[PDB]
């Protein structure tokens, strides 16, 4: 039922994600990692051999695995997601999680850097660029997306519905019940429209802005998968997590 959809999705978002925008802004207002020296100091405390870029790569992909698991439980709480055939549930998650990951990642980013290690570290934007290629080519487009996404000044209530709409996308390749998933998205999107009307009355054009952000994220992920394959084939020590290689396979 759509009368409680917005609250239900927001509650599921607060329930399932270890980090959100309210929690992140409080912290951002944390050990600062800005060079090889502070990276090693941070790793001495927050990590239980390999090249510095491969170590960050592993900490990054381990974070994504955790976010994928949180997103999986979040989707389970979206009304109607569990009723879909299990193969449709896998497809929606497969193509949706990284659009959602980079959307939510904006919440822990500012112009100078981003929070890492469950809010305990803050790595600078310049240090990531100072790394060697191709590892220094990864985070730049995400910071750029996050900068324009953060300018919309969404809160966690807006973001929860946005992520739900990302997951329940009837456009994904290989979906079985397209017509029903499309109806699920229509309801989520309609609830999002109504919520943006009440929560952001100063911007009566915020909803088309968010529609474009969904398209921008699909392009950001497709280009990102290209880098995942560059690393999988040409970086020996940069082993891929089984869950992530499952997600990126044939996508």
């Amino acid at each position: 039922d759509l009368k409680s959809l917005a609250k239900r999705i927001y509650e599921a978002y607060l329930k399932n994600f270890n980090m959100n925008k309210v929690k992140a802004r409080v912290i951002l207002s944390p050990f600062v990692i800005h060079d090889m020296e502070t990276l090693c100091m941070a790793e001495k405390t927050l990590v239980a051999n390999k090249e510095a870029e491969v170590r960050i790569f592993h900490c990054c992909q381990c974070t994504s695995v955790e976010t994928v698991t949180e997103l999986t439980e979040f989707a389970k709480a979206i009304p109607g997601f569990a009723n879909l055939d299990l193969n449709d549930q896998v497809t929606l998650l497969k193509y949706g999680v990284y659009e959602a990951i980079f959307a939510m990642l904006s919440s822990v980013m500012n112009k100078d850097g981003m929070l890492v290690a469950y809010g305990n570290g803050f790595i600078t934007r310049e240090f990531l660029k100072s790394l060697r290629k191709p590892f220094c080519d990864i985070m730049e487009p995400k910071f750029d997306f996050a900068m324009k996404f953060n300018a919309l000044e969404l809160d966690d209530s807006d973001i929860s519905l946005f992520v739900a709409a990302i997951i329940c996308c009837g456009d994904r390749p290989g979906l079985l019940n397209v017509g029903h998933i499309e109806k699920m998205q229509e309801g989520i999107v309609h609830v999002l429209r109504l919520h943006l009307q009440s929560n952001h009355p100063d911007d009566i054009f915020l909803f088309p802005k968010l529609l474009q952000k969904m398209a921008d994220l699909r392009q950001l992920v497709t280009e990102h998968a290209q880098l995942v394959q560059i690393i999988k084939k040409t970086e020996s020590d940069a082993a891929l997590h089984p869950l992530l290689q499952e997600i990126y396979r044939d996508m």
Binding site: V68, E73, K76, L86, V90, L93, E246
Partner: peptide, 9 residues
């Protein structure tokens, strides 16, 4: 698949 394993929790 692991994604199936996550969804059958």
């Amino acid at each position: 698949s692991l994604l199936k394993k996550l969804l059958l929790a």
